[PDB]
Design a protein around this ligand. Structure first.
Ligand code: HEM
Ligand code: HEM
Ligand SMILES: CN(C)c1cccc(CNCc2ccc3ccc(N)nc3c2)c1
Ligand SMILES: CN(C)c1cccc(CNCc2ccc3ccc(N)nc3c2)c1
Ligand SMILES: C[C@H](O)[C@H](O)[C@H]1CNc2nc(N)[nH]c(=O)c2N1
Ligand SMILES: C[C@H](O)[C@H](O)[C@H]1CNc2nc(N)[nH]c(=O)c2N1
Ligand SMILES: [Zn+2]
Lengths: 411, 407
C-alpha cells in the first residue's frame, strides 16, 4: 500500500511506504480522528519479537542483514531473554536506538539534526548521586558555553517496574512556580506542583520569579533525592529587545538548554524510563508558549501596555503585535549572547527539506501537523501547506505517568 | 466509546457522546492519522431518508408520533415509486442549517441557526439560476450588514441533469498567465478564468477582475452571466497608520460565497447550493494576500515598512503579516462591512463548542482548520482538544465540473 502527500503551495507530491512498518496505534479510527488529542512489567512472550524486529532493523542499517554476526546476536539475545527475561543492548545498538527514536519523533520539527546526537551511556549508574554526576556532565557538554550540542544520557532500563530510574523533573532546567495565598502565581505556573514536591522534600526555595529548580532523582526504585545543579553550569540569557529599551526592564530571562527528562525511551522492547535529552530552542517555544500562554508567564498585556497599543478592541490585533515583538526579543537576546537558537522560519524550512530527504532515502517521514506547525505565523511557514502522515515507528520516545502518582514510598 | 476532550488552558473537560452517531468515514486508521490531508439506489436511499427523518422529528419533539410514522411511509412510498423523493420546506431548512452545524472545519458555527434558506428547487434554466444568485447576493450583502444565506437548486436525479455553479465562489478575481512568466491577478483562478475565455468571456485583463458566473442548469452546458457590478460590494484596503498602504492598490470583496460544494440531506444530493456568511479577517489578510500561491504581497509590504529582510530571524515576515491583517480589519470596519477578527471568532467558537456539548452531547471539530493561520496559540482554540468526525446532513466537496461534464 502506497500513500501520497501533497504540498499545496509547491504541488510537490511524495509517496510514503514507510508507514507499512508501523506497529503501535494512533488513537484514530475510521469513524473518528483524534489527531488533536494531546495524550492518546512486560513478558518474555512479547519481548523476543520486539528484540528481533529491532535487531533486524539495526543489522540492515549496517548492511549486515542475515550475516553470521546478525544470526549469532539474535541467538545470543534469545538465550539471554529466556534465561533472564530481558537483555542488554550493545553500545552500538543503544546509540542506533537513541538516534532512531529521535528520528521517529513525529512531533519534532528539529529532526534534520537526528544523526548528530551525543549518546551518554549511564547504564552503570546505581545511585541518585551517580545520576547527578552524569546529569551535570550532560549539561556541561550540551551547553558548551553557548554553542549547544544535542545529547542524551541513558540510565538503566526498567526491570520489574519496581526498580525504575526516574528523573522527577520534567526538564533538567526549569523555573520554580509558587502559588500565593491571593491566588496569583510567582514564577512559572507550569511548575507549581513540582515546586511543591521539592519544597516538601526539603528544598529551601528562594521564592523569586526565576528560581532554577533542584533535581529530584530516583535511582533503582528508591525514594528520590534532591540536588542543586551547580549555578555555573546553568547558562541563562537576559531578554532585551533591539529597538525597545524598556524591554529589558520587564526583568525577563530564560535558560539556554531545553532538556526534556520525563520521557520514556523504548528500544527493542526495552524500556529506559530515565533518558534526559537536550537540543536547542526554537524561539517560539520561549516567546510564544513560555512567555505568552495565559497559563504560563502571561506577559502579553504588560508588553502591550508598554508599546501603547490600542487594547480596547482585539480587532486592533494588539496581542499579535506584542507577540511578535516578544519573539523578536527572544531571538535577538540569544544571538547577541551567542547562545544557539533557531527561528521558526529557518526551522520549518529545514524540516521540509529533512522531510523530502526522508521520503527518498527511507520511504517516509511520520509527522504530526498539529505539533510541527509553529504556534505563531503558521501559514507563512512552509510546513502549513504540507500534508503529513502521522504514524508510530520504534524506537520511540513515549510519555509516562508522573512519578509522584505511581511511586511506592519507602520512607 | 465515551470520549473526553480537555482544554489545556482552562482544565475544562467535556464528554463527547455525539460521535456515536457518526456515519461517514474519516480517512484515518488505528495505524495512520490523516488529519492533515486536505481531501482524504433505492436501497441506499431509504435508510438515509429514515435516518434523517428520525432526527428531524426528534428535533421537533415528535419522535415516534403518528405524523412521524406517516411521513416515514409517505417517503418510503415515494422512493419505491419515483426512485427518489422530495423534502418538505421545513425539512429542507432543517437540513441546511444542520449541514452548517455539522461542518467540522467551520469556526463560525455559533451562527448556525441564523441561516436564511432560499428554496430554488423550482429553477429550470441557467437564466433562472442567475436571478436567484443575484437575489442571494443582494440579500446577504445587505449594504454591508452581512446576513448568512444559502440558495438551493434542484437535487441530483440521474447525475446527467446536474445543477452546478462552475465558479468556486460567487465572487472571485480572475487570473491570467503572462508571457513574462508571471501571473496577473489571483493565481488560484487561472484555469477557471481560461475556461471563461473559452466559453467567450471578454476579460479586462486586470488584477482584480470579478469573474462572471458559469451556470449549469439541468445538466445542460454552462452559460456566462455577469453579476451586476452594483451588487458586488468591495473594500479598498488602507492602513490606519501607514499612509503608503493604499498605494499597493489592494481591495477585496465583502461577500464570501462558497459555490462549489455538495449539500447532502437524507441521501439527496444538492450539487448546486451556494452559501455565504462573512469573512474572518485572516482569510483575506493571511491566506489571500500572503500565501505564495496567491497574491503573495509579503515582500512588497515588508519593503515599504523598511524592515531588515536579510535574515529570517528579524521576523520581518511576521511583522508585515500583522500589519496586513490590521489593515484588512480596519478597512472593512471603516466601510461598515461585517468582518470578524480571529480572536473574536475563536472565542465565539469555544462558547459554541461548550453549548453543543451541553445541548447536543458534542461538536465535531477539525483542529487543523479551526486554528487560525496566524497567532494560533494566543487564541483559545489552540489549547482545545477537538474530536473530528463526520455527521449528516453535510457539505462535501465534489469534482470540478469541467473534468466531468459531457460537452
Ligand atoms: C536540536 C534542536 C531541536 C529543536 C529545535 C527541536 C524542536 C522541537 C519542538 C519545537 C518540539 C515541539 C514541542 C513543543 O513545542 O512543545 C519538539 C518536540 C519533540 N522533540 Fe525536538 N527539537 C530538537 C532536538 C531534539 C532532540 C535532541 C530530541 C531527542 C533526542 C528531540 C525529541 C523530541 C521529541 C520526542 C518531541 C515530542 C515531544 C512531545 O511529544 O511532547 N528533539 N522538538
Ligand atoms: C457567518 C460567518 C462565517 C464565518 C466567520 C465562517 C468561518 C469559516 C472559516 C474561517 C473557515 C476556514 C476556511 C478556510 O480557511 O479556507 C470556514 C470553513 C467552512 N465553513 Fe464557515 N464561516 C461562516 C459562515 C458559514 C456558512 C453560512 C456556512 C454554510 C451554510 C459555512 C460552512 C462552512 C463549511 C462547510 C466550511 C469547510 C469548507 C471546507 O471544507 O473547505 N460557513 N468557515
Ligand atoms: C507541561 N508540559 C506540556 C511540558 C512539560 C515539560 C516539557 C515540555 C516541553 N516538551 C516538548 C518538547 C520536547 C522535546 C524538545 C526538544 C527540543 C526542543 N527545543 N524542544 C522540545 C520540546 C512540556
Ligand atoms: C477548491 N477549493 C479548495 C476552494 C475554492 C474556493 C474557495 C475555497 C474556500 N473554502 C473554505 C471556506 C468555506 C466556507 C466559508 C464560509 C465563510 C467564510 N468566511 N469562509 C469560508 C471558507 C476553497
Ligand atoms: C495541509 C493542510 O490540510 C492545509 O494546508 C490546510 C491547513 N489548515 C487550513 N485551515 C484553514 N482554515 N483553511 C485552509 O485552507 C487550511 N489549509
Ligand atoms: C490541543 C492540542 O493538542 C494542544 O494544545 C497542542 C497543540 N499543538 C502544540 N504544538 C506544540 N509544538 N506544542 C504544544 O504543546 C502543542 N499543544
Ligand atoms: Zn486522525
Amino acid at each position: 500500500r502506497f500513500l501520497k502527500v501533497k504540498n499545496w503551495e509547491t504541488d510537490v507530491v511524495l509517496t510514503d511506504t514507510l508507514h507499512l512498518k508501523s506497529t503501535l496505534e494512533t488513537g484514530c479510527t475510521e469513524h473518528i480522528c483524534m489527531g488533536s488529542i494531546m495524550l492518546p512489567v512486560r513478558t518474555k512472550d512479547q519481548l523476543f519479537p520486539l528484540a528481533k524486529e529491532f535487531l533486524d532493523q539495526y543489522y540492515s542499517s549496517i548492511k549486515r542483514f542475515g550475516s553470521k554476526a546478525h544470526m549469532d546476536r539474535l541467538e545470543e539475545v534469545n538465550k539471554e531473554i529466556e534465561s533472564t527475561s530481558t537483555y542488554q543492548l550493545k553500545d552500538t545498538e543503544l546509540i542506533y536506538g537513541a538516534k532512531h527514536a529521535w528520528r521517529n519523533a513525529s512531533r519534532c520539527v528539529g529532526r534534520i539534526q537526528w544523526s548528530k546526537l551525543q549518546v551518554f551511556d549511564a547504564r552503570d549508574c546505581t545511585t541518585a548521586h551517580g545520576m547527578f554526576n552524569y546529569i551535570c556532565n550532560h549539561v556541561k557538554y550540551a551547553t558548551n558555553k553557548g554553542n549547544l550540542r544535542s545529547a542524551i544520557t541513558i540510565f538503566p532500563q526498567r526491570t520489574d517496574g519496581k526498580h525504575d530510574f526516574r528523573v522527577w523533573n520534567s526538564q533538567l532546567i526549569r523555573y520554580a512556580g509558587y502559588k500565593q495565598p491571593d491566588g496569583s502565581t510567582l514564577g512559572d505556573p507550569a511548575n507549581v506542583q513540582f515546586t511543591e514536591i521539592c519544597i516538601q522534600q526539603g528544598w529551601k526555595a528562594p521564592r523569586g520569579r526565576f528560581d532554577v529548580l533542584p533535581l529530584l532523582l530516583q535511582a533503582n526504585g528508591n525514594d528520590p533525592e534532591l540536588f542543586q545543579i551547580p549555578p555555573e553550569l546553568v547558562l541563562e540569557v537576559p531578554i532585551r529587545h533591539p529597538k525597545f529599551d524598556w524591554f529589558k526592564d520587564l526583568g525577563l530571562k530564560w535558560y539556554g538548554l531545553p532538556a526534556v527528562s520525563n520521557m520514556l525511551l523504548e528500544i527493542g522492547g526495552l524500556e529506559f524510563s530515565a533518558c534526559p535529552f537536550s537540543g536547542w530552542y526554537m524561539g517560539t517555544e520561549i516567546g510564544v508558549r513560555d512567555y505568552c500562554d495565559n497559563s504560563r508567564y502571561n506577559i502579553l498585556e504588560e508588553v502591550a501596555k508598554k508599546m501603547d497599543l490600542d487594547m480596547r478592541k482585539t480587532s486592533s490585533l494588539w496581542k499579535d503585535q506584542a507577540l511578535v515583538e516578544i519573539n523578536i526579543a527572544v531571538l535577538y537576546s540569544f544571538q547577541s549572547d551567542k547562545v544557539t537558537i533557531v527561528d521558526h522560519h529557518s526551522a520549518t524550512e529545514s524540516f521540509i527539506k529533512h522531510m523530502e530527504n526522508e521520503y527518498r532515502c527511507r520511504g517516509g517521514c511520520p509527522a504530526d501537523w498539529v505539533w510541527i506547525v509553529p504556534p505563531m505565523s503558521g501559514s507563512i511557514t512552509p510546513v502549513f501547506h504540507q500534508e503529513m502522515l502521522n504514524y508510530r515507528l520504534t524506537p520511540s520516545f513515549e510519555y509516562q505517568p508522573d512519578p509522584w502518582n505511581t511511586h511506592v514510598w519507602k520512607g
